[PDB]
Amino acid sequence: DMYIERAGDITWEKDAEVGETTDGVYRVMTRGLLGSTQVGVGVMQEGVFHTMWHVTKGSALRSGEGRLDPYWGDVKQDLVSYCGPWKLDAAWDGHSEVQLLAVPPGERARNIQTLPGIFKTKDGDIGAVALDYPAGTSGSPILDKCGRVIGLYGNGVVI
Amino acid sequence: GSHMVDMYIERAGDITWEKDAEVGETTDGVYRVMTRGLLGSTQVGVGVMQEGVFHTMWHVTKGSALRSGEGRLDPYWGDVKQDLVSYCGPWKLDAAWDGHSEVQLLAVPPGERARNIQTLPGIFKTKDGDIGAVALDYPAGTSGSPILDKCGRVIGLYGNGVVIK
Ligand SMILES: Cc1ncnc(C)c1-c1ccc(C[n+]2cc(NC(=O)Nc3cccc(C(F)(F)F)c3)on2)nc1
Numbered sequence: 001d002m003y004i005e006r007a008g009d010i011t012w013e014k015d016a017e018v019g020e021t022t023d024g025v026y027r028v029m030t031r032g033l034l035g036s037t038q039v040g041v042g043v044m045q046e047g048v049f050h051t052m053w054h055v056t057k058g059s060a061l062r063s064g065e066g067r068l069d070p071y072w073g074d075v076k077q078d079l080v081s082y083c084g085p086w087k088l089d090a091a092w093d094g095h096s097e098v099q100l101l102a103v104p105p106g107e108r109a110r111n112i113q114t115l116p117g118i119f120k121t122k123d124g125d126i127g128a129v130a131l132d133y134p135a136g137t138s139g140s141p142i143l144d145k146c147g148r149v150i151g152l153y154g155n156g157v158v159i
Numbered sequence: 160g161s162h163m164v165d166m167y168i169e170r171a172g173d174i175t176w177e178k179d180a181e182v183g184e185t186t187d188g189v190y191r192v193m194t195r196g197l198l199g200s201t202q203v204g205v206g207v208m209q210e211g212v213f214h215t216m217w218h219v220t221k222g223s224a225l226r227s228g229e230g231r232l233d234p235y236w237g238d239v240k241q242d243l244v245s246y247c248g249p250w251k252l253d254a255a256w257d258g259h260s261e262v263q264l265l266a267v268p269p270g271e272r273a274r275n276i277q278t279l280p281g282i283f284k285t286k287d288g289d290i291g292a293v294a295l296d297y298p299a300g301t302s303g304s305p306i307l308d309k310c311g312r313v314i315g316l317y318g319n320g321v322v323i324k
């Protein structure tokens with residue numbers, strides 16, 4: 001039994017550290033007998049819930065009273081969307097600072113501004129934020145200066 | 160008010176690459192740089208003893224003499240821009256990152272055990288220059304912790320990063 005609950009708006013913050021379909025950033029929760037815990041984070045935008053495939057593994061999600069079914073995915077890229085196509089088309093410019101809107105398990109959302117590093121791995125040269133958050137923070141949106149989601153926290157971006 | 164009175168080093172480990180890793184006395188080794196005063200003692204950074212010379216970051220000591228047990232280490236060389244300082248002799252640490260390999264941070268954090276963390280350095284295209292750095296975050300008194308190549312050579316100190324031109 002797996003569900004989402006809202007955690008905040010998706011905003012670029014000045015003064016940062018350097019079923020219901022409301023736009024915003026959501027905790028992805030799994031419950032059982034003992035109780036509930038966060039498996040990841042996602043982004044509601046234009047009526048579509050975006051998270052990482054490995055967070056849900058294509059499970060349906062309860063959203064209050066309603067139920068969200070997966071619409072699309074890509075296991076290689078580790079992406080999955082609910083209710084509609086992938087709406088997050090923005091991308092890192094390759095030079096600017098970005099903001100991780102990290103939403104850790106059992107803690108408040110927060111913006112961290114940082115410059116992405118480039119990691120020259122074997123598979124490819126990969127851009128990633130040098131910020132380390134607990135497991136279940138995966139799917140936290142990363143924002144450009146215009147407030148657009150340029151990626152989700154967990155994997156990084158191939159160039 | 161009250162001021163700090165005594166800066167000193169104490170040994171924390173050998174400087175080795177660990178095969179099973181997370182993916183005055185002048186004994187070779189890695190050392191905590193400690194400052195004591197009235198209210199107690201606090202770790203202000205880390206340094207490397209190699210070939211009779213203690214290597215740390217300028218901002219850690221600011222060129223103070225260091226107690227090493229009973230004896231005294233006086234600074235021999237420094238560079239404030241590069242944030243480097245040596246004691247008892249010239250800078251011995253001449254190795255550098257090869258630009259492709261994984262490295263190991265031998266982090267020595269305040270009030271915790273030494274440990275090796277293996278990681279691939281990232282390159283950060285800052286305004287001033289391109290900077291290579293490990294994507295590992297530790298408290299400020301970890302600064303001066305050696306970063307190692309697979310030959311066991313200190314290729315850097317934790318805290319600033321390395322300029323690439
Ligand atoms: C990638 C890598 N290769 C080799 N060794 C290491 C240690 C790493 C490494 C480095 C940092 C982190 C911490 N981390 C980052 C994320 N996710 C994320 O950054 N996503 C994202 C997506 C779109 C755009 C961007 C941005 F705009 F910043 F380029 C970033 O998750 N964990 N992990 C692994």
Ligand SMILES: Cc1ncnc(C)c1-c1ccc(C[n+]2cc(NC(=O)Nc3cccc(C(F)(F)F)c3)on2)nc1
Binds near residue numbers: 130291294295316320
């Ligand atoms: C550098 C930078 N620019 C812009 N934005 C950010 C967020 C950063 C950024 C990224 C990671 C860290 C964490 N961190 C690393 C170190 N120090 C260190 O890595 N030293 C070192 C010295 C010699 C060789 C090498 C190696 F071989 F790895 F290249 C590394 O201290 N803190 N800080 C800041």
